[model samples]
Target chain A: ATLTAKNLAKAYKGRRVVEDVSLTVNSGEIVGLLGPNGAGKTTTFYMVVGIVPRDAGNIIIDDDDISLLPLHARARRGIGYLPQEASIFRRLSVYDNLMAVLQIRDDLSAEQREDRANELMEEFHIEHLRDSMGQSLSGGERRRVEIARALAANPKFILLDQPFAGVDPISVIDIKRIIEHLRDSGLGVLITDHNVRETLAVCERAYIVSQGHLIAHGTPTEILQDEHVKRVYLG
Target chain B: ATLTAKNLAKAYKGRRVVEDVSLTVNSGEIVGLLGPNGAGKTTTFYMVVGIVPRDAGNIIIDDDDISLLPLHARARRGIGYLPQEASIFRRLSVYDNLMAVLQIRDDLSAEQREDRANELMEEFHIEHLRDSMGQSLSGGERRRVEIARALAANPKFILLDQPFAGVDPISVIDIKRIIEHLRDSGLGVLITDHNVRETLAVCERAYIVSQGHLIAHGTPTEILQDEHVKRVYLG
Candidate 1:
């Protein structure tokens, strides 16, 4: 299975934010979308996940056109999204946060949901923080919980936006390990981040975008050597 | 000169968040306050900056106890604080954000304020973003502007809360270099962050807090060797 976006374009206030940006992620592979601030990386993620409507583009997931679907509909179609802001419920306990995501499946009984949520918490090394509120977790802990929640439904593909944004080195290591596990499990992964070093370190392939345009795409080393990428992004 | 907090204590909803915590940052020194989540690092910063009144504590700047002063009064007495969240006016341009901070000093003429703001933009490597709006800046750029605003007042000591949080690696390097320059320029700095490696690399001394108590205080290497810090924080 694969996720692809073709000729993706978006505009805000008469200015183009994302134009003709195309990218792909294949099953069992980790792909990176690298860019600077306001580089339309976030916009592309939003469009891909159906969080925002794209003015022009086609989002195909497993050969199904999901471009017209709403956010929840896309999730139901097997696209789990972990937003940049760590969108867990602050008032909810860590356990409850995972449960909330699991409860979305009508097929799961209450007992099954509870068991699955606990399993996810244990898998993410957050069982010790089961009773802790979302607001109480550290930056790393929050990211872990968010990732676990994204996996609750066993989505075919996961879109992680800045998973290491405010995380410490230890947490980054843990998150990367989890992403590697996900890729090994044959789940397609597309991660967007400004932290180029780690993004390159983890991803099998990368696509660099700037000013809403797909500027470069290659292996991390090749992207690093690209003159256009150097002048426009790496600086 | 030094900024010192003596037996600082604070409580929220009848629970103590900070207790008997004492830390100091000397002139030309960079100090790191490292801790786990809800360990009261940010609460400590709030108490020091007078953003929240401490239940009990003594805050000494240089030789004077400034615990009873209000926020702006502390600023007047030379305490510049950069919050974890960028506190810039989102509606204002980058240039105007600095100008607003510069305008706070009654000693500077309008012309001098403009020139000083421009100079800070250049110093922070953000001259190219001067005309951009504060709301449009990326995580790193916002941090640079905030640091520049904090320095606009020419404070004797600066309190930075998670300056590298959510910033990219390139931007983190830029911000770290700027902080190093601040330390070399004889400005005492107290920075709280979860990025352990870089925080330890930048700080001459570090204080580790857990559950609001000062559990360890030493050089970065010493803190690394301290078993309690390892169990409570580094884990």
Candidate 2:
């Protein structure tokens, strides 16, 4: 399967933010969108995720245009999004949280949702946290549970916003492994992050956005060697 | 000025989280508190910042025991805290946001507060953004205004929580320089962040908290070389 975005453009009020940005992610690959602050990297990513309505663009998966779809509609079409901010219910236990999503989104009965949620908990190695409330879980533990819950939805292409925002070095490596495992299982992944080294380490291909345009796209090494990337990133 | 924390301990719902942890910071230096995701670092840092009450400990500044003081009182006693979350009023202009804090915490009259706010805007190089609404500022620009507002209260020490959480790499470097300048200006600074590389770049000395214990304390190089740290951080 393949996910493609074409001619993405967006403007806020009268000011342009993202324009003519296009990118692609194939099955079993991770693609990153990175840029300096306010460079429209986030805007483009959000537009692709269907959270933000783009001025113009076509988000296509397997040749089906999903740009006109709302967030939930896009989710049903196989796009899953994880926000930078905490998404789990603080008061709900991990199992309960997983069940909520599976029950609502999965075409499963109550017992089926329970079994699927249990399967995810075991798959993510979060069985011990199954009874723990989201608020009581540590940063790494909470993230593992959240990712497990996301998998319960069985998304074909996953969009992660700032996956490295609030985790320690070890958990960063852990999340990277999880992401790699996702790709190994034939999932297409798109990630946008502020942490350069961490995000670059995990992405097989990357797109660089700057000044409302997609200026560069290549592997991590190529992105790093770009002269414009250096200047735009220098303090 | 010297800021010292002694024998700090905290427990949540009868479970010990941070125990017998202590650290110190002095004027003209930036100190870091660091650890893995589930470690007690944040809880201990919060105790010193007075955001979370400690079950046992003493926070002292010079000759004053400030453990019993609340967050606002600690602010008045020369501690300025910048939260990881957005701190500025989204609807207010940068200059207006600065003056709002100055009007309340500052002893300056209305005209004097205006002058002081302008001075801060110039000092932080945010004069060009004086009329820019907080919501419109980029990550770097918004952080500059927030730090400027933090200084309006004339605090001798400042606490920055995850200053590198949301910004791009360039903004991380920009904030690091500002922190160094703050140290050079004879202000004590305490920082806790998950971004080890960025936080260690600005800290002269650092304390490591793990599993309710203060595990290591030293320079960045020394902290990196510790065997325990390597084991804890290895994925």
Candidate 3:
């Protein structure tokens, strides 16, 4: 249940946003993606998840090349992705959003999906909004629902994009706890966020992507100690 | 000279965003206005600057109740404001934007205006952008020019709304230095931004405006470290 990517590149209109990027996340590990705006972190993440096609690269999940896989294939491979913008089904309730994703997979029946959704919502402190529409929730609450929806697939690896953006401090700690719990349960987790200090607090390793290039990669402390990361990312 | 407000309030469709809030700024001091989104910091700032009329309040600037004044009259009274979005003239060159502001005052001839504009462009490290259109500049560069433009009128007070929003770390420090320099030259400044640590670092005093109420005011360190501030705004 590990993820490996190498030489992943993406370009729009011949302007490269991700070039020669490579990374890895082992099981039970959490990695943070650190960079300034327009550094191509999002582009790299899209490449890994197959949301957008890459110009060149290989994405290997558990040693299996998933570069040619469709979006459904990638999701079936247990690679859960939470994008920076929480694009949950605004019309659906939190409970139904999880149900919709689960129903699409045919992995669980109605009863099982309902039970699992309840458990996830309770775990993430979003059970209180089980009947609330996605749009009705606050930013942090909607974010929690998005996480719960991502987790319903029972992914072995989770990729969260700016999971803490617009979140309250208490919810931040709560979400961090949930992520750590996922890691403890043997899931490989990767996060791209601007909360440098908080991201470092929970992530095992981090990668610094600058100007569409993987400028630095190492353990969280190592990345944070780098002069560039310190001066630019962590202040 | 001091800016004062008594029982200030703003309401939208019978829902109050700022409720009976009052605050003061001495002749030459910097203050930080901090709060989470929807906490009413912006509304309070708008009411104080007379850019938006309050439903009910007394806004007194140097003993003059200017709550009913128009935006230009308020500006004439030395109220400089830099909004979250860079509102500088995008079609004009950076130097031209600064010149336009000074030209309105008729304080300097064309030669003096040109010299002063160059001095500010160099001071803010935008000398190279003296001829570049405002919209073509990077986020950081535009911010530097905006701050420079805010000071072009030799304002008695300046209101900076999230001057560091989306600004890179390097640019944050650059803007901070400019803000400090302005305060040193005896300008009253009110800054509302999301960067808690930096806001505390730069402002001697800070206030928390929430739900349209002025909840707390104190030195930056004292307020930022307070239990409530950390609990409510640090999320």
Candidate 4:
């Protein structure tokens, strides 16, 4: 399956912050959206995630256009989004956190929901933290739980916003490994980060946006080799 | 002169969180305090910063024992502190932020304080941001403003708590270079972070803590090569 953004555009306070930007992601691939601060990457990523409404664009998955859909509506169509802020309930238990989202799977009976939650716990190596409250887990542990919860919807593509923000080095390795697992499992991943090095290291390809435009798109080495990338960001 | 934390200890809910920790930061040096979550590095670091009062042990600089001194008291003793949180007044201008701290130097006249703020703005390459409010600046820009304000106290030593947390990769490089500038200017810097790699890259030496005890202390190369470090943190 392919997720494509065509002619995406947005403006704020009479200023066009993102314009005519486009990118494509297919299942089983890891893609990155990168740029400097206030370079329109944030707007472009969220517009693609359906978190922020776009003024002009088409978000199409195969033949279905999801441009008009809201976040939850898009999620139901298999577009899962993990926001920059914490999405899990701090006062909720890990099991409960997963169940909160899994309960939305009306096709599954209560027993199957519970079974799926347990499976996610085991798959993410979070069985030990099954009973732990979100308030108590370390940054890394909490992150795993968040990712597992994001996967409860059984998404084909996951939008991870700033996965490395506020993350420590050790946990960084852990998250990268998890991302690899997700990709190897054939899940499409779109990551946006200020840590270009970390994102570039994992991504198969990346799209660079700056000054409200799609400046470049290519493999990691290609992106790094571009002189525009140097003058615009890496410098 | 040296800022020394000797035999530092703390406890909570009948559990010893940090115990018998000792480290030193000499002028013109950059030191790191590192460990996993719940390993007591945070408490140990603050004990040296005088942000948190220790249950037991002493914080000494030169021959003066400043163990009982409060944060402000320690600030007056040439020990500056930049918190993990945004220390700048978000609603205030960059020049105003520096003046807020600079005004504390009662010895400086009003005009002298203004002059000093201008000098700091120039030194940190923030002269253009002089009129910009803290909330208007980007993360990297705000960080420079904060560090400039910290130096306004003319501190001999500065304790930076998680300088890399929530910072982007580009800004991470920016802050590291700033730290180098501080060290080269004959200031002592003690950095505590979960980002061991970044800290190790910038530090001349580091101290590792785990399960409330100091596990290792050495240069970056030595710390990385230790087997105990392998089991305790790297793994």
Candidate 5:
């Protein structure tokens, strides 16, 4: 799978919030979209996944142009998106919540959905939370469940916005392992997060976004070595 | 001026959320309330400033008990608070927002309030945004305005919660410098943030709170060097 975005742009009122930025994600690779707060990373992700319309741009996946696809249509094309912070249905059991997303999107039989959800649960290491409600799970466990739900869609690629925010340290390691596993499964993973060191640690390549522009893109180590990057984030 | 928190405790549904956390802040001192998420830091601060009721606690300023003081009463004693990320009024102008918070509690006359606002604005380099709408300001700029507004009360003690959570580097530097300047003016400040290295740089001491408990208290360097503290945050 190849995810290509060109000249993606969006504006609020009269101000251009996201400029003519472009990016790419090849299959079986993990790419991080790095930026500080209000850097338009969320806006860019929303545009790529077809949640909100872009003023102008092109989004393509696997040689198919999805420039005008609706959110559902984009999801149908194997684009799975997880928001920065989710509003989970607290009363719903983690098992039910994940299964619901999968069942709603894919018309699988009850047995098949359960089987698939369970498999995903195993992969993401949330099998123990199958009976636990949303409020019952710790921050890390909930995060794993969310990631598992994303994978339940069997996406060719995943776009995660701040996936690791507020997660515990051990769970962060778990999420990283899940991402690595996704890459091994030949899926493209795109993430935008503030934990620069950890975000860079998980991805093979990463891009630095600042003030709505794609400022720099390269391997994680390369971006870390950039003085401007440090000055922008670590200073 | 010195801000003293003695025997602070809070609970939710009989479950303790802040347990006997005691801390002291003297004039010209800047301290950080350090902890992982779900820690008692926020509850402790709320208890100190009388914004939220504590099951049992006492906030002492200059050796005077203020535990039973109302919100306004505490504010009159020179205590300022900035919540995590959601402290600003999005629709108001930075100048107007600052003026609004200040007017409600400022002891200064109208002319003096304006003068103080202008002085802090120019000092923080946000005078240009005095007329700009709050919603129009960037994330970094909004943080500056938040700090400026909190300082407008001419408070001797300032409490900042996760002040640098998602702000850019330049804004972090600017806000930090502003805090340092305030301390130099004989104000006592308490900041809560997760960025360990940077938090240590500005504060003379750090308090470690976890699971509603005051786990440790020491200098930033000492806290970071502590094995348990390192394990709690890093692993």
Candidate 6:
């Protein structure tokens, strides 16, 4: 499957925040969205994720126009989003968090749902925290659980917003390995992060956005050397 | 002023979550509460912040027993808290976030409120984000604004729950410096973080908790070399 966002535009209080941003990620590919603070990387992601309405844009997934789909509809259609805030049911336990996501799959039996939830817990090295409440888990633990939840439905495309922000070094390596595993398994992933170096390391191709515009797009090295990008970072 | 927690204990469904925990933070000192996942660090912090009711504990601040005080009442008496979640008003702009907190200062005139808010925005390097809504700010940006708001009330003691969690390296350094600045200004600071090394770097002394028990307490180096701490990490 492929995810394509074209001519995405949004405004806040009449001031344009994301203007004409376009990007694409093919199946099994890893793409990066890099930008300085308030550069609309998040706004573009919001439009694609459908949590926030876009002023104007086209979000096409697997040749299907999904720009008008609601968030749940999009999720059901295989677009998994790991929000920057680590969205999890704070009141639920770790096992229950994964179960909540896995339970949505009517294809799976109750036993299969439990198996899948257990698989995620073990896969993320959070097996010990299975009974722990979401609020009680560490930030790293929460992110892993959230990612596991995002993948519960076996989505073809995944969107990770600042997956490494504020994570401890050990968890950084852990989450990065998980993303790599997802890409290796034939899933297309789009990541937006302020940690330029780490994002570049994981993403095969990168887009640099500044002042609500896609100023540059290329490999990690190319994006690093771009004069405009340098100015955006240093200035 | 000093903040103290004595014989702190809590439980959920007959399961002890925080048991017989005690710690202290004196004026002009920075202390750390370090622990593994589900170690009740957050539960302890919540009790200190007065957001969650403690099953049993004495939270004393500056010679006054504030255990019975509500969150706001304690805040009015000089206990500022920055929860693990950034607690800024999501619908408000960056400036309004600070302004809302600063407005509680009955002694300050409108001009003084604006001045203090701007001062904090500048201090946290969020001046450019003054007009941006809380929901739109990046994770790092939101954390900085939340810290500034915690300090807005000029509290004598501040509790920062997971201050370094999910923050980028640059922002981590920036926040660490700000925390040091706060300590220098005579405010007692109590911090908890999963980033053990970073927490140790910023804290003069630390307490290590595991499975609801206060297992160890000492300077960073002392805590690092302890056999029990090594076992906690490896276990």
Against the true two-chain complex, what DockQ does each candidate achieve?
A: 0.36, 0.61, 0.16, 0.32, 0.26, 0.23
Candidate whose TM-score is highest: 2
Quality class of the docking in candidate 3, CAPRI style: incorrect
What is the C-alpha lDDT profile of model 3 across A4-92, one tens digit per residue? 98999988667777899999998899988878756787778888888989899899988688889988898888888987755789999
lDDT of each: 0.85, 0.83, 0.79, 0.82, 0.79, 0.84
| Model 1, runs deviating above 4 Å | A125-138, A221-235, B10-19, B125-133, B210-235
TM-scores, one per candidate: 0.86, 0.92, 0.71, 0.84, 0.84, 0.82
* The 10-residue segment with the lowest total lDDT in model 6 chain A: A164-173
Residue B154, model 4, lDDT = 81
If both were scored by TM-score, which would come out higher, candidate 4 or candidate 6? 4
Please give the C-alpha DockQ score of model 6. 0.23
lDDT of 4 by residue, B52-125 (tens): 77899999999999988888888888888776556789899998899999979878999999999999888777
lDDT of 5 by residue, A1-235 (tens): 7999999999987667799989999889999988765678878898999888999999998778999889988888889888755545688898888877877655688888888888888877677667778875544456677777777788888998777755555567778888888899998999876667778898889888877887788998888888887776555
Which stretch of 10 consecutive residues in model 2 chain B shows the poorest summed lDDT?
A: B138-147
Enumerate the chain B TM-scores of all models. 0.96, 0.89, 0.94, 0.88, 0.93, 0.96
Per-residue lDDT, model 6, residue A131, is 90
Candidate 5 similarity to native, TM-score = 0.84
lDDT, model 3, position B15: 67
List, residue by residue over A41-158, the lDDT tens digit for candidate 4.
Answer: 6677789878778999899999999898888888887888776556778999999999999988978999999999999898777897787789766555676788888888888889
TM-score of chain A of each: 0.95, 0.90, 0.95, 0.90, 0.92, 0.95
Q: lDDT value for candidate 3? A: 0.79
- B53-78 per-residue lDDT for model 5 (tens digits): 98887889987988889988898788
Quote the true-contact fraction of every model.
0.26, 0.75, 0.11, 0.21, 0.28, 0.18
Candidate 1 per-residue lDDT over residues B1-235, each given as its tens digit: 8888999998876778899899888889999998876678888998999998999889998778999899988888878898875588898989999998888879898899999998999888789778888887766678788888888988889998888766655567778898899889989999987778878999999999888898999999999999988877786
- Best-performing candidate as measured by DockQ: 2
